[PDB]
Amino acid sequence: MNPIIYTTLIMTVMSGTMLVMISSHWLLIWIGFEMNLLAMIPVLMKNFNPRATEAATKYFLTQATASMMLMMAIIINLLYSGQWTITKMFNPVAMTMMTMALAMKLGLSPFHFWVPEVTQGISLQAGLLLLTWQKLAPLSVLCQISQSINPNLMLTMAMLSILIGGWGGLNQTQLRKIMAYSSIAHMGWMTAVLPYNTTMTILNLLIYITMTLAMFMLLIHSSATTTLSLSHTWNKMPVITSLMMVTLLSMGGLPPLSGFMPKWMIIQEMTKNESIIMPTLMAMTALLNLYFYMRLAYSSSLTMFPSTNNMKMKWQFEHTKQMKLLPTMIVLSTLVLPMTPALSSLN
Amino acid sequence: GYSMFAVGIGTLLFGYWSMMKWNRERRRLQIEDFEARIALMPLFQAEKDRRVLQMLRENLEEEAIIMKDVPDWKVGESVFHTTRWVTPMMGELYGLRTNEEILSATYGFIWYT
């Protein structure tokens, strides 16, 4: 692919997301989604091979079905109230269809199956984009229509997402599928607090995005897509594996690391309403994500796996391309808890 | 080579000038017809108001005759909280008439070719 064409496609993806974020008209929001998908399909196919083509096809089918349901919900809402402005969604059937369409776009359970497959079928850069930038538009719409949400449906989907993310991640040796299941669980956490406080949703999204960016950038720096290939990195660059171990611990939600901050905050918010059983269940379930993060840390940093002879040659060369934002991303992923009250600036 | 291009360009320019003159004349004629319609509009509005009111009154009297059997039916009761005038839905003007008039009132203009 031409670099000019790649830049144009990335800019079109971002423009579709921005159009979703700045629009007041439902038609313009739908157009933003369409433009984002149209530009996103070729980016997933940048390195051409059958797996990338399969991932792109599955992604297109899922997102096109979601957009059809989105448009039908908009039209039903218009039928029962001649309104185009994104507001309290005057019809409940239309609101149910809207919620299901947005959940399918986000990959929330039980519309979760496509996320591990698409993530595994594409490159690490495409996976970074898909798991970070592609969450902004549906979450922005959900934040805008939160007051009309049905808490039962969204809470059911969020709890299912957390459970399924943990259970599915428990079974993986491929790093991209691990990241996808982690994303599913974190989306569940984000949507669990949405009917109560959208500021907490934004805070969780920001912290998750920072940690995911650090994770994907560390995985690109050490060209590993499997557990066994990541188990070699200690014999080439131990600093990368140590930073990865601390980042995994933060993603597990352990204090005093930054990944503990959202869950903590969310739990507190849920106890400001009554909502006692659900946060307890959510934390006990997030223990599963912590377990498979810890297994990855065992494989890559806390023990030393056997290496190969040809690795000696790799000792003689340095990394050519350097990521300028990786150190700041790591620091923000780990040492940010003491600045928790700054979340007031989010609302 | 040059002669053919020149002849074509001259033909195009002559056609452009003729069409400009004719289109301006047609615009003036349209303005005149629109002014005639504007002059005629108030009488049509008055007769339309009288026709609508007469149909509504006939429907009201017929409904008052019909619906006196039932216990709890207020005759001529509105369906709107507001007390201002609401344009009739045309299922209210032609609701008690033959299907020929209903067809002519609904699809008469669309089907006229």
Binding site: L28, S81, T198 | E62, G95, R97
Partner: protein, 105 residues
Amino acid sequence: PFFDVQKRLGLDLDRWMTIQSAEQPHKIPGRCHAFEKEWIECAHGIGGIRAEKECKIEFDDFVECLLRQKTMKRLSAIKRQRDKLIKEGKYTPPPHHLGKEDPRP
């Protein structure tokens, strides 16, 4: 979530098409222009929570104009009673209704 770029810059990217009571070409009015105008003026500035209760009458009138459910219910009741009366044979329907009416311009 929503970055009100239009409000900050005063651009009007899409607000011209959000409602039916907003500056149509040739001043063509919507079928429910007055009802929507009244509901909007009632609900302006007080927030959605208060508007959902204090502007319920205007919204109900607007929805009745939009979908016309009660009007069809009333028309169906009248027609059913008339049909029963004629079937019993007591209706004695008028000439204008039957198409024998003296039309006016």
